[PDB]
Amino acid sequence: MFLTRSEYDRGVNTFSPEGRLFQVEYAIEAIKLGSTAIGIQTSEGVCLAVEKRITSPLMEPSSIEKIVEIDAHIGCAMSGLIADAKTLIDKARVETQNHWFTYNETMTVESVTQAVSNLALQFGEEDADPGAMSRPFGVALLFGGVDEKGPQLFHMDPSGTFVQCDARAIGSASEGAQSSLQEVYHKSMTLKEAIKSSLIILKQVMEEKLNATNIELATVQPGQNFHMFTKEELEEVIKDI
């Protein structure tokens, strides 16, 4: 007995019988097409890790940039369409800077997520401005930073909803990685344990064997600014696994 008619899925601005707004839901599915990214927030700091998914040896590894710095305090790991991420990372970079100009202070991770989220929400044709993408954005960003409240990791989704998460995985293997994260995460873990744990989970989810080239890892401990482990540093941690 199969009823597969659909017919309300196509076209945002259409509510399905049952009020489900399917186009947005489909966008959330897109992040599954993307490479898995896992973030652990610990008292010592928030660590972000992603799988590069390098198609050909000729492509230069540095160019793939799935972890980027919004500002020294806040960094973002993105999984999903790379292009729509670039717009969202840009709104964030401008908003952090606009806050410094207007208020001479550093935006909290939550405000920065609210700011990018506000752009994501506009996909609904909420505003009359011509330059707003009609499609919901297809990227999910994990934003982690040290703020007044200390290390914080917020996860944002194509819907535009954002929530603090002690640990979250966005991406192809997010289901299952999240399950493993649930078992491993304990609030007391130090960042050193988290980096090892996150990389262990990534090794399991990733199809290719883990190598310094295939992974990008970053940390924002409270004293330090966003730091991306260099190949040498990555080699040391992967060796420990």
Next chain:
Amino acid sequence: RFSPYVFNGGTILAIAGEDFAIVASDTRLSEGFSIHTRDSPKCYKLTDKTVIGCSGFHGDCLTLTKIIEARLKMYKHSNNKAMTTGAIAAMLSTILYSRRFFPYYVYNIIGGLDEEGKGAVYSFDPVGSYQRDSFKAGGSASAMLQPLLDNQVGFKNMQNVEHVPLSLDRAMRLVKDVFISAAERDVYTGDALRICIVTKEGIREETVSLRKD
């Protein structure tokens, strides 16, 4: 023909302290030679840790206070925290510059407690230049009041005199005295002085009476 501004007069003073910040002001609004009202305090409490003092065209002061008050609420809703004194100062700087071409004729002083818990005074020019200053007097009597504070609070031009951190009591005594002097020699200042002391407990408002003209 129409002149968009009038000098409504008034003087504002702010003295910082290791743990306290005092902002004080006259209560007389005067247009021309006439006294519009003898009870218009020029100090407004932006937040528990900050007070703004504005002197100049009153109409601009009322609008600016309304704008700053609104923006403070918007910061609270968006960022889920109170604006610090440092932030209010930077926001005011930007707000004032917005009208560089048709300016707000307001001399503004923001005094408050900083995040460290120390007292900070921020003084702004009419077009928004802001400097963190230990003591500042603004308004019609800035000229008369500022020198005294500099000798007494800043120990300037005094040789062989020890430097003692100001105490809330010595400062209240000093503020009352400087305003008494201005009442005598500045026509604009007079009627009453509202002294607002911001301390970890919060703003406390004390009113003393200066000479009615």
Next chain:
Amino acid sequence: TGYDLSASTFSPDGRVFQVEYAMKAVENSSTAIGIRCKDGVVFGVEKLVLSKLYEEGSNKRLFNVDRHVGMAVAGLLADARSLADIAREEASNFRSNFGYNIPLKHLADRVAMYVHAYTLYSAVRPFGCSFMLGSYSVNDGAQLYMIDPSGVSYGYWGCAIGKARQAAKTEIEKLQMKEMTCRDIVKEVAKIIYIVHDEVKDKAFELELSWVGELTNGRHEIVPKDIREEAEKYAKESLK
């Protein structure tokens, strides 16, 4: 048949169905009646109480569109509140430019034209609300005007809108309203509202009564609770 999908379209037989479909919306709503007597116009709405939780004296279907005119609405309430806003704006404009209280006949026409516009374009659906406006001015007299979703406006000596419109009209017809005075009509409106209400289908109703006339000094106002209570008693007794 694609003729009914839009209001821009005209059916091969000449009928714009989308407007007719909108008119069916008013029938979904509860009945509301307005009767014009010599002194002034009395409007009554049977407001179903969907839940005990909803506050009494709220969810009003009778709106004051200006000091001298009152509007009773039936149909999708959201559209009605919006139409009421359009009417209030129009009334303000007539006072602002022409300097006097809007003549009701003109008000009905201006609001009707706005309602009709929606009928022509394909971007906007026809409004789903049918409303009655009434006013008393010493010079103009007592005027009751009803506007359909189509934008047709006509003046009615007595009028009914809503689910029981046909039944109510029969009762209103036997009233000799022209001779009757405003205070007496309030009792009569209630009797009709009670007669039309179907207890089995609709659990319970609160009668909301409003009036404009010489007694109100030409201000549309909610009937004082003493007068309403007396009328509700007269109605139950008559229902027997």
Next chain:
Amino acid sequence: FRNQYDNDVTVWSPQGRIHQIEYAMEAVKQGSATVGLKSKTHAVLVALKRAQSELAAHQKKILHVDNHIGISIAGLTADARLLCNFMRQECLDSRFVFDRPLPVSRLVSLIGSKTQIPTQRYGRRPYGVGLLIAGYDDMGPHIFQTCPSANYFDCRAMSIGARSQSARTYLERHMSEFMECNLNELVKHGLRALRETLPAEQDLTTKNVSIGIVGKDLEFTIYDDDDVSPFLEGLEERP
């Protein structure tokens, strides 16, 4: 078939019903339940927050529009964030222009007007957030609910959200007691009513309950995870 007549907000159905608006109304049911009740001196909003995962924090269901007004969202969060901003700006505007807290009722009328425009014009989808608005103004404590359809209602009490009939049922039976209730009693009555919505296995915890209280002397305050503990401790056990 009748697949036709459901595609757009601009198409009236053969029987007078705009289906998309109804479909939008269904969205509120998808959201977690929230209960709002009023006493002669106070108005209370209680919400059952939901979490994506154990690691994830519970979502915010209660948001502060102004000192005198606060809202609880049931439905798509995005529509709520947008409506809340409009409401906050409308309130800020009144204080700058008239220096008076906006009457709560007037704000709800404005939310209704903004909400209706999507319903009649091709283009933007009807807002699918259902909002419970609570405030104390000079007239008194007020509790109002707004449907995705622009219609708004003033209520002695209301619960919007999934399994909210159960809450409405409890509220109706214990409704008379609410008017003379003390604040602790009123929040307690509400926490019990939302408990009915919860599945039998689930229990109210400090983590999933958010309470917002506004009153003559109380500015709207959202008591959250550790601050709901005073109100929750007094409660009994599941019936």
Next chain:
Amino acid sequence: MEYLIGIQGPDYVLVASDRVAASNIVQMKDDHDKMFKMSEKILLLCVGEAGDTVQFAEYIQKNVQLYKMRNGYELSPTAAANFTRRNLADCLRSRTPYHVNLLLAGYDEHEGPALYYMDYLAALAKAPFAAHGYGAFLTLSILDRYYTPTISRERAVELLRKCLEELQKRFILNLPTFSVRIIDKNGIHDLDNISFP
């Protein structure tokens, strides 16, 4: 207050400018260069109200360069002049008139050497020799007296040196050093700065 001089010749155009940029009375820079190379064989020399000079020159330089990238052939000296004039003229009516006086010097293989003069009002005139600035009043006559349409390059630098020495002897403002460059079929060639120590 700034001096631009250009002498066209049988096969070359020689252009010179003072190297001084100044504020009210302090000569902030002694090495300003007022020559901007629009193309391999076109130089625009611009003197005028501060800001307007650099802004107009850069806009013209880039637009001329865009033509080179887009079409593959550099614009002819005459065409460029007409283009700069159109732009300045269009602006003159506008609320943002660039107050700039320009001399454009170029060599086109087909049409040979060319020197064009445009005033702030945007008039364009091809001229055998021209100068812009208060200095021009003193030196235009020296060129007029000693210029032959057949002047040799060596003779031209000499004529230019004579023109500049008058500015040293009589002009009130101190323009100590001048930059000299020649455009020929080969292209813009820098020549030693003529410096009166």
Next chain:
Amino acid sequence: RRYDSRTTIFSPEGRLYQVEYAMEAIGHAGTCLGILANDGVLLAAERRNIHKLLDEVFFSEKIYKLNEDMACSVAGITSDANVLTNELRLIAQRYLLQYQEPIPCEQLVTALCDIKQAYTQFGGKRPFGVSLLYIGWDKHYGFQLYQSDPSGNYGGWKATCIGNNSAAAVSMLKQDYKEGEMTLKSALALAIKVLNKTMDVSKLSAEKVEIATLTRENGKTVIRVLKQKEVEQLIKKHEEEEAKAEREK
């Protein structure tokens, strides 16, 4: 199913069908031929219109003089052509106002082609259904012939024919044209020969063809439409020349 409507939808296989469909229209149009010769460039077109009651009031139905130094012939929807020719004439005049020099020939073509690409990219407008041959002398590259397509793609061709039986003409031209040896006289002859084969009518009417030549004389380009007597002589010369080859055979 249908990925061929709206002009903005790439088909699976990446083909923009609406542009391809537009190109089909040019095929129905009357043949237009351009040959580049060392001395001059010529455009010859077949005036498909032959209804007896039509008047030759205009200088040419299908040859238009865009500017002093260039000319164009259009094949395709006539109305679309009128719009493009008006635009080309404005684009050229704008270059002259700005740079006070004649527009280089490629640039005029590149600019019109850009208007043509835009119509393809944006959603509402139909792609322009005209293909046009531009002939001109520019100081930079001397005599040049360029052909344009509804796609907005342009090319420089020594000789080409657009329109009905274009393929046959190109084949004939490919064998017949001698690179570096063509003279306007020889080319006009090549044109008559190719036109005769492509056109269905056994005898070129001499009222069924319009031939226009651009030559630089005395330093100024002259675009002249050959008058009917001149063309009639060319047809007679061809008829005789071919007959002589048949008589030899």
Next chain:
Amino acid sequence: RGYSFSLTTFSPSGKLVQIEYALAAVAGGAPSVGIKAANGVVLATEKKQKSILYDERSVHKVEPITKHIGLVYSGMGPDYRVLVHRARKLAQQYYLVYQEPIPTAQLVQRVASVMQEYTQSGGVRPFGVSLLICGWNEGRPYLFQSDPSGAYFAWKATAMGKNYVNGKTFLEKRYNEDLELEDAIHTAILTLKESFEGQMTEDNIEVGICNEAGFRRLTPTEVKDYLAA
């Protein structure tokens, strides 16, 4: 299929169908004939009216754009008025700018450009009227037709409207380039007579003549005389 409904969609085969459909509207229109004689151009059309009730003086099929240019139409009547008004306006704009009466060829190019504009956008419908424009400029008679497509052709003589094909054939047989207008007006009434399907009467037909004097509509009495032949 899909190609037929849209106006911005080229059908496989590169035909814009809605325009073709638009031309079909002109064909259904009342017969109109135009003959360009050496001394003048005669435009004539059938003005058959459903009832005696209609007042003929009220509306005229043949209209004067300017003193020397006049037009006749076959197609949708409401559309003709829009084009006529735009035409009368386009001519006055020429006079203001160049202070000379507009050359006929120029007006036809300008009116046609307007027609093409309507064709491009999806929102509008192509005009469903074809116009025959007749004018005397520079001592030379001119006749032009502008079809809904936006294309103008110059005809020594042509017929648009019902039985256009048969009309053109009759005209080709009866057309002599040296014809004078007095003879030509007779030829035209004969061409219309071929497809009238009713007794022609002065009212049933409307005729206009362009010469050095300029466009004029023969009044009913004059036509009665010509019909008497």
Next chain:
Amino acid sequence: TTTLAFKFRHGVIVAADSRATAGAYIASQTVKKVIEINPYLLGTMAGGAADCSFWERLLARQCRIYELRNKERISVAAASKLLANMVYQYKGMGLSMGTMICGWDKRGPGLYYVDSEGNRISGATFSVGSGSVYAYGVMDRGYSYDLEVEQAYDLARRAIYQATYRDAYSGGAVNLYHVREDGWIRVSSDNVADLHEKYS
């Protein structure tokens, strides 16, 4: 105000006074006139303080966005051109600014002067403000590309001091910064009075 900046082999030395006067009333003797636009490039303010601070602050935001977007620090030249372009757009509306953006970039030590009028000039030695004229003289006599860092610091201090003595609208304390290749370091903040004692 007097602001002095010179480029020497070891870097750019930027110095400034601290007095701001409204009319003839010295509103503040402690104004910080060297604005730290970035950890690596610094600017100075002469002319209206508000105009300089807002516009320099905006440049700093632009510079950070570029560093984040382009993953490299903006060059001093580019920075100056952005500031110049922004101020020119407001030409004739009354902004008064004279600023000397100073930084070390790949090109080397870089010092530029941008003015509200629009001039942007890069040079070894520049001084802006009411007292510039007095300062240029002392700096000019003692300047050399090869100056030991200590001597360089002394020249700047003597130069602002001589300026403070002659110019009424300049005075207060001399704040001196050295832009080294790594970044700006704040060498000193001597009050003029102390300087009067040392120099005399």
Next chain:
Amino acid sequence: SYDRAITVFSPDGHLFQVEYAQEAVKKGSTAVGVRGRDIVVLGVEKKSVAKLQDERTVRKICALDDNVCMAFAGLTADARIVINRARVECQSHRLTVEDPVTVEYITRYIASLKQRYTQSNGRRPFGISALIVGFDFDGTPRLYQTDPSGTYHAWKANAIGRGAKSVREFLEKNYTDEAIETDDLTIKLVIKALLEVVQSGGKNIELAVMRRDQSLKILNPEEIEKYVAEIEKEK
């Protein structure tokens, strides 16, 4: 079903119209780029002379500015619009920041233009993928590639266009530090790779080299003949 509009997202979150535009690039002529230590070489196949067609007009390789050169594969007309827009930006950056554009800035700008077209319905994605080669201020050679989607990536060597899969495999095996050691060797590698996919020989390849400060040079057909000969002889 989910392939008719760029805005619509498929169940499974695939935007089909963008993918289809990438298919268009495959139909286009091949292009190969190799980042040599001191030279960046960009080589493109030429479809055919056609005999009566002048070849000057058809140029796949173009210079965006003095330090940046671009080669494209895909709808030819779209490329001409993108190339022109990039040229305006290169000059505009020079106006705004006084500095020559870095290769990446041009790549990001070109990519954003394409993304802008993908983002809204009512515009069709530009069906071009481009290889932008440039030397930066440091003088490091940089090669970047862009796709109709708007993703930019840096490739040490890459091939876009028809047969790209085959050449890229050849390049993966052939590319080595040893191959890039000599500037001639670098030119040889691209020629050898294009030979793998070109049906004809050297007659059908157009190749260009940009040196550390020299402007882009399109190698003369004779110079290409010499290189193909050395390669054929060594074979």
